[PDB]
Design a protein around this ligand. Structure first.
Ligand SMILES: *[C@@H]1O[C@H](CO)[C@@H](O[C@@H]2O[C@H](CO)[C@@H](O[C@H]3O[C@H](CO)[C@@H](O)[C@H](O)[C@@H]3O)[C@H](O)[C@H]2NC(C)=O)[C@H](O)[C@H]1NC(C)=O
Ligand SMILES: *[C@@H]1O[C@H](CO)[C@@H](O[C@@H]2O[C@H](CO)[C@@H](O[C@H]3O[C@H](CO)[C@@H](O)[C@H](O)[C@@H]3O)[C@H](O)[C@H]2NC(C)=O)[C@H](O)[C@H]1NC(C)=O
Ligand SMILES: *[C@@H]1O[C@H](CO)[C@@H](O[C@@H]2O[C@H](CO)[C@@H](O)[C@H](O)[C@H]2NC(C)=O)[C@H](O)[C@H]1NC(C)=O
Ligand SMILES: *[C@@H]1O[C@H](CO)[C@@H](O[C@@H]2O[C@H](CO)[C@@H](O)[C@H](O)[C@H]2NC(C)=O)[C@H](O)[C@H]1NC(C)=O
Ligand SMILES: *[C@@H]1O[C@H](CO)[C@@H](O[C@@H]2O[C@H](CO)[C@@H](O)[C@H](O)[C@H]2NC(C)=O)[C@H](O)[C@H]1NC(C)=O
Ligand SMILES: *[C@@H]1O[C@H](CO)[C@@H](O[C@@H]2O[C@H](CO)[C@@H](O)[C@H](O)[C@H]2NC(C)=O)[C@H](O)[C@H]1NC(C)=O
Ligand SMILES: *[C@@H]1O[C@H](CO)[C@@H](O[C@@H]2O[C@H](CO)[C@@H](O)[C@H](O)[C@H]2NC(C)=O)[C@H](O)[C@H]1NC(C)=O
Ligand SMILES: *[C@@H]1O[C@H](CO)[C@@H](O[C@@H]2O[C@H](CO)[C@@H](O)[C@H](O)[C@H]2NC(C)=O)[C@H](O)[C@H]1NC(C)=O
Ligand SMILES: *[C@@H]1O[C@H](CO)[C@@H](O)[C@H](O)[C@H]1NC(C)=O
Ligand SMILES: *[C@@H]1O[C@H](CO)[C@@H](O)[C@H](O)[C@H]1NC(C)=O
Ligand SMILES: *[C@@H]1O[C@H](CO)[C@@H](O)[C@H](O)[C@H]1NC(C)=O
Ligand SMILES: *[C@@H]1O[C@H](CO)[C@@H](O)[C@H](O)[C@H]1NC(C)=O
Ligand SMILES: *[C@@H]1O[C@H](CO)[C@@H](O)[C@H](O)[C@H]1NC(C)=O
Ligand SMILES: *[C@@H]1O[C@H](CO)[C@@H](O)[C@H](O)[C@H]1NC(C)=O
Lengths: 1026, 49
């Protein structure tokens, strides 16, 4: 039998308490929604691979014990755990599978303790793991109802015990008890663990309450990548998809002969260090196993190549330098050690690939009387270049006097030999040393590894190897023209893109298997759980080739676009507004087609329209709307301060002393942050403090029907803000702050309190509603609000009579607009997006900065205190300085991002100051600057780290068609409108303003004369009153 | 590091020295990516202007 594991196989990853924190783990877990085997144990009539999850819904504990091993047939030792009425017994012995086993020959571990096995049956969850000879048990008891097998119940397994088993385990089997042999039935559940990434949610009590399987479905993948159990509607860029290779191909030249390593390991007698022997070895196979153990060695230190990989490396040409050296000089053979022998006998290059083998030769070289046959030279005018020998035994004159002939006094000729004696040599003992040096991937390889060639495959991406050149990708016939000497094909990125087959003369291209970005398009996690997957710039004929979740790749619904191809959305012919942009004009939405589904479509750019253009047709509005629109502008951000000592070094004296050398970096960081904070105060001052005096609204708030109660401050509330200001303050939401403070990242309060910012705003409001634009220029001059409104009307080319003749209507429109602002602010939380996301950016930056402290930066650990406790200074300080460099780089990155963010905030604050100067302190003519339509005035409202402008705009509406003429010819002379336009209702002509239909009789004051009617194109005939 | 290609580093080195080279290589490439992203942020600020 088989079934589905809904929420089983979760345990506490480690013995550590947490609280209200979403933690990502990567470890052995039972995958979510897995094929769990439902076993039945009946009397009337299992591989232990990568951990095992065992569940028992048993009553009266028939199932008792388990066995663990590789064969369980006394081929090696084995485990058994078994339990009975009072206790449990664990044994590690040579067991022949006490009916369970026959004999126990050699026993290594025994254990007795409290038993682990303690129709309303209960689930007794166990997790068994073994890693590096350590066997861990996790367990949990959950009493369950009589509903059905494996309910939707969730609970983690607390750790019980770990045992040092130290034994190869491949298979396990469980054990049953019988009370005879009465017939009966039982049942258990088996699951297999896999290396998976989980997200665990901790409650206030630190119990793992919920989990998300990141590598199960795209939705959970987005959940794991955002580290949240709820995902907002949109598109999220998840892990990259990669077509995995099929097999491995190795191609080598057909070389079978062995490299003569025999003569270099044991010759008649090795050439001396001054005349060290070299030969090129090539065109053979190199292996160390047969010959290394024959001449046993004591110093094998290798630099570029591990000894085990040397058999798996394919060479071009190799050299060995074999010579007799003094024992005590065995440590001079490493690159860069200098001395008499280094500068005059032998030296190897500082940067090379190769290593040395040294072993004893006293019993074969040393003589009782002294073996003075191995020459070594100490004296020469010039040093010895690496990999060079000199055999000129020219007389050397140490003294300043001239030295001629064969020898002379104060002349030290290069003739001295070793005093090698068998027993007297301890550190003076001769050592015969062979240094193997080689060059890889510079020339075509000849001396290659024992590894055998493989058959050549094409149009299937593979792990291809060509004479040590390793890559992965598809192989194709080459249109490039190689030459006999040419071996490799290089790209712009200095990465190999072509190969020559070492077996034949054929040349091949390289193209790694298809890949590209993966995006997940989801609605609100609350709204739905079905998602769409976009494969960016990938042909949808290749994702079937990519057939770890494969369920969506077999989808019944595929749509191809320029951005890539989409799976899980139905393409439609209809055009809607874009909500989730895909790219290249494709947008995704979620609606009913009666079932709900995700759809993809071509985004509409709005409703199609055709303007009724003609020779002489004009559209003049007859009505208006006083539209109040909110414009939100960030003005300042949270003034941040950082201490190097607290953040980088915590409270360590040693770290402080190692850091004070980087004082320049810390002073520049502090200077930059102080500049940013003073700039935030300057931003607030420039935006708000534009007024010399604090004005007060009069107690009699009579403004010709304009009721500013929702924007003027309310004395009733302690905080002297307005209704709209209070709503804005409540909408923006400002533990992790305590951790930020404890890690040395502090928030300096703004110079201006919210109360004084509100007082500045109230002064601006009072000045605007009582004086108008005058208080911006010089002394505030009082003026009735009606007259100010008439002036603002005159500003937008509307005659002031319009407002006075419609005063009550305009006042009611403004009041209803303020009501709509209140309703919109109270209802939706998406109103103050900009301020909220600015706060979120600052919070995310500080959270990222505090999370960087968990980074190791290549050190032993990310906590300095344990480094100091467990290490003496001489490497404690090098670990600390690496940690300091890492954290200082993190601080520099944070400060740079803060400088760029502060620059963008300063741009916003300059724009806000300009808007307060041009929209609040006056009427602006700049189109769409102070709101959509003809700007009349603006009202500032303080908001958390920003301002809100209530842009009052005139918007024409209820337009009507009219016949129009560019001019009027009355007495043979053209007439033009002084300030207006000519329109005809069908019988008579009238002059009217451009933004409000109001006809007037054509008289000599509405019109001015210019030239005659035989030049102007489109002039008409009418009469003009004197 | 010994070289600029990871594959040869993995082929020629046993895990510890391989990783002590690879971490330096990752720090270098991450610094290059950070420099690119910072220059892109400044360029995007000027483009936004
Ligand atoms: C210009 O547009 C104004 C609205 O934008 C419009 O005011 C509206 O006029 C209509 C008709 O007179 C009123 O409609 C209501 O009339 C009575 C009394 O309120 C109600 O019992 C009816 O049910 C009906 O809804 C609107 O109340 C009124 N709107 C406002 C805000 O006052 C002007 O009349 C338009 N001007 C011209 C010249 O057409
Ligand atoms: C100026 O405009 C104000 C905003 O429209 C308006 O305030 C509103 O006044 C009414 C009273 O007429 C209040 O109505 C409420 O009264 C009681 C006490 O709060 C409540 O229990 C009732 O349920 C009812 O809602 C409004 O609360 C109040 N505010 C709002 C937002 O509507 C003034 O009355 C106007 N005054 C003048 C002189 O024009
Ligand atoms: C397991 O136990 C058996 C029996 O004591 C051991 O077998 C003996 O091994 C020694 C040493 O090789 C021999 O001299 C004896 O002749 C063996 N006797 C028998 C009866 O086989 C065996 O060595 C033990 N194994 C381990 C790993 O300790
Ligand atoms: C965290 O653990 C505590 C104690 O186990 C829980 O506190 C109990 O909660 C229940 C339900 O609200 C109350 O009836 C008890 O009086 C509480 N006991 C105590 C000692 O405080 C708490 O509920 C747990 N948290 C959750 C989310 O269940
Ligand atoms: C996906 O692959 C197909 C081929 O299977 C591409 O179709 C080719 O497109 C090129 C360029 O437009 C034409 O020259 C070929 O004649 C087409 N071949 C066939 C068989 O139709 C298709 O263009 C690819 N998708 C995208 C988005 O480029
Ligand atoms: C001004 O007149 C033009 C044409 O006389 C109007 O345009 C027509 O509008 C009707 C709907 O009212 C459509 O069914 C026609 O297709 C339109 N025809 C053309 C040629 O555009 C126009 O609507 C009038 N202006 C206003 C404001 O009503
Ligand atoms: C065009 O507008 C003029 C406005 O003068 C209209 O002419 C008036 O129509 C009213 C109808 O009650 C008469 O009482 C006036 O005596 C007319 N005055 C003049 C000077 O003619 C004319 O009817 C309008 N034409 C339309 C709407 O087609
Ligand atoms: C406006 O009226 C004048 C005269 O009242 C028109 O001018 C006449 O045009 C006709 C031919 O169209 C000529 O034969 C006359 O000699 C012209 N008379 C004068 C005095 O110039 C004029 O055409 C009318 N406007 C339009 C646009 O038709
Ligand atoms: C579980 O695996 C078995 C053996 O391959 C198979 O027969 C069975 O259909 C699988 N069950 C599920 C639910 O996948
Ligand atoms: C359980 O088994 C152990 C192992 O032999 C034994 O010593 C113990 O007496 C047993 N207890 C019961 C109650 O069967
Ligand atoms: C290389 O040698 C093998 C057998 O050693 C042979 O099968 C193959 O044909 C040779 N290569 C060429 C190009 O002839
Ligand atoms: C999901 O929608 C419901 C309304 O049905 C609402 O109560 C809830 O807050 C929403 N959750 C999220 C995360 O948007
Ligand atoms: C969308 O339009 C194309 C082109 O007319 C058509 O082939 C396709 O069937 C349409 N899709 C649907 C769902 O009707
Ligand atoms: C505009 O006026 C000219 C000259 O009177 C005429 O030729 C043309 O047809 C008119 N335009 C239209 C769209 O009728």
């Amino acid at each position: 039998a088989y079934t589905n594991s809904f929420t089983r196989g979760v345990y506490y990853p480690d013995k550590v308490f947490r609280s209200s924190v979403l933690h990502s783990t990567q470890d052995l877990f039972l995958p979510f929604f897995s094929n769990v085997t439902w076993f039945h144990a009946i009397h009337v009539s299992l591989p232990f691979n990568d951990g095992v999850y065992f569940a028992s819904t048993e009553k009266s504990n028939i199932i008792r014990g388990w066995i663990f091993g590789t064969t369980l047939d006394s081929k090696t030792q084995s485990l058994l755990i078994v339990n009975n009425a009072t206790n449990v017994v664990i044994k590690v012995c040579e067991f022949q599978f006490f009916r369970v086993y026959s004999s126990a020959n050699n026993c290594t571990f025994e254990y007795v303790s409290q038993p682990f096995l303690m129709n309303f049956k209960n689930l007794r969850e166990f997790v068994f793991k073994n890693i590096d000879g350590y066997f861990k048990i996790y367990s949990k008891h959950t009493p369950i109802n009589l509903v059905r097998d494996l309910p939707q119940g969730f609970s983690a397994l607390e750790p019980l015990v770990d045992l040092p088993i130290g034994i190869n385990i491949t298979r396990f089997q469980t054990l049953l008890a019988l009370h005879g042999w009465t017939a009966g039935a039982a049942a258990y559940y088996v699951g297999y663990l896999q290396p998976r990434t989980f997200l665990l949610k901790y409650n206030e009590n630190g119990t793992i309450t919920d989990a998300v399987d990141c590598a199960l479905d795209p939705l959970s993948e987005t959940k794991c990548t955002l580290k949240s159990f709820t995902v907002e509607k949109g598109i999220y860029q998840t892990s990259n998809f990669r077509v995995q290779p099929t097999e491995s191909i190795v191609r080598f030249p057909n070389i079978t002969n062995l490299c003569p390593f025999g003569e270099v390991f044991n010759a008649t007698r090795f050439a001396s260090v001054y005349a060290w022997n070299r030969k090129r070895i090539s065109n053979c196979v190199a292996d160390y196993s047969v010959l290394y153990n024959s001449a046993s060695f004591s110093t094998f230190k290798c630099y570029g190549v591990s000894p085990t990989k040397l058999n798996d490396l394919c060479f071009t040409n190799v050299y060995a330098d074999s010579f007799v050296i003094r024992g005590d000089e065995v440590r001079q053979i490493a690159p860069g050690q200098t001395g008499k022998i280094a500068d005059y006998n032998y030296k190897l290059p500082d940067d090379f690939t190769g290593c040395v083998i040294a072993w004893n030769s006293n019993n074969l070289d040393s003589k009782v009387g002294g073996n003075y046959n191995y020459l070594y030279r100490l004296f020469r005018k010039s040093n010895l270049k690496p990999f060079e020998r000199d055999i000129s035994t020219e007389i050397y004159q140490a003294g300043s006097t001239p030295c001629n002939g064969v020898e002379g006094f104060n002349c030290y000729f290069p003739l001295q030999s070793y005093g090698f004696q068998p027993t007297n040599g301890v550190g003076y003992q001769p050592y015969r040393v062979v240094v193997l040096s080689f060059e890889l991937l510079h020339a075509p390889a000849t001396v290659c590894g024992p590894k055998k060639s493989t058959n050549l495959v094409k149009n299937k991406c593979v792990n291809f190897n060509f004479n040590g050149l390793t890559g992965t990708g598809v192989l194709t016939e080459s249109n490039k023209k190689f030459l006999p000497f040419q071996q490799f094909g290089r790209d712009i990125a200095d990465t190999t893109d072509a190969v020559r087959d070492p077996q034949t003369l054929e040349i091949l291209d390289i193209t790694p298997c298809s890949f590209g970005g993966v995006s997940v398009i989801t609605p609100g996690t609350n709204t739905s759980n079905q998602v769409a997957v976009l494969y960016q710039d990938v042909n949808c004929t290749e994702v079937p080739v990519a057939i770890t979740w494969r369920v969506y790749s077999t989808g019944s619904n595929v749509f191809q676009t320029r951005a890539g191809c989409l799976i899980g959305a139905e393409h439609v012919n209809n055009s809607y507004e874009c909500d989730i942009p895909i790219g290249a004009g494709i947008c995704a939405s979620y609606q009913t087609q009666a079932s709900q589904s995700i759809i993809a479509y071509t985004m509409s750019l709005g409703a199609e329209n055709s303007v009724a253009y003609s020779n002489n047709s004009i559209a003049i509005p007859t009505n208006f709307t006083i539209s109040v629109t909110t414009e939100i502008l960030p003005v300042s951000m949270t003034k941040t301060s950082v201490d190097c000592t607290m953040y980088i070094c915590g409270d360590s004296t040693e770290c402080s002393n190692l850091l004070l050398q980087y004082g320049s970096f810390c002073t520049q960081l502090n200077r930059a942050l102080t500049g940013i904070a003073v700039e935030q105060d300057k931003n607030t001052q420039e935006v708000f403090a534009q007024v010399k005096q604090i004005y007060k609204t009069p107690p009699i708030k009579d403004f010709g029907g304009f009721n500013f109660s929702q924007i003027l401050p309310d004395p009733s509330k302690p905080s002297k803000r307005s209704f709209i200001e209070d709503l804005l303050f409540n909408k923006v939401t400002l533990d992790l702050i305590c951790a930020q403070k404890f890690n040395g990242l502090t928030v300096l309060p703004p110079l201006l309190t919210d109360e004084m910012i509100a007082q500045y705003t109230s002064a601006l409001l009072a000045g605007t509603i009582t004086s108008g634009w005058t208080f911006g220029a010089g002394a505030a001059l009082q003026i009735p609000f009606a007259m100010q409104m008439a002036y603002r009307f005159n500003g937008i080319g509307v005659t002031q009579n319009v407002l006075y003749e419609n005063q009550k209507l305009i006042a009611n429109q403004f009041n209803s607009a303020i009501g709509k602002i209140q309703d919109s602010l109270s209802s939706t939380a998406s109103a103050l997006g900009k301020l909220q996301d600015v706060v979120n950016q600052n919070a995310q930056a500080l959270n990222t900065l505090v999370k960087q402290l968990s980074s190791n930066f290549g050190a032993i650990s990310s906590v300095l205190n344990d480094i100091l406790s467990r290490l003496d200074p001489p490497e404690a300080e090098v670990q600390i300085d690496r940690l300091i460099t890492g954290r200082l780089q993190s601080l520099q990155t944070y400060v740079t991002q803060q400088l760029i963010r502060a620059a963008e905030i300063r741009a916003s604050a300059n724009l806000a100051a300009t808007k307060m100067s041009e929209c609040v302190l006056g009427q602006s003519k700049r189109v769409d600057f102070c709101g959509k339509g003809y700007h009349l005035m603006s009202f500032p409202q303080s908001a958390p780290h920003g301002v809100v402008f209530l842009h009052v705009t005139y918007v024409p509406a209820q337009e009507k068609n009219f016949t129009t003429a560019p001019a009027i010819c009355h007495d043979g002379k053209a007439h033009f409108p002084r300030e207006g336009v000519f329109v005809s209702n069908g019988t008579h002509w009238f002059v009217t303003q451009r933004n409000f239909y109001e006809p007037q009789i054509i008289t000599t004051d509405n019109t001015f004369v210019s030239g005659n009617c035989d030049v102007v194109i489109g002039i008409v005939n009418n009469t003009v009153y004197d």
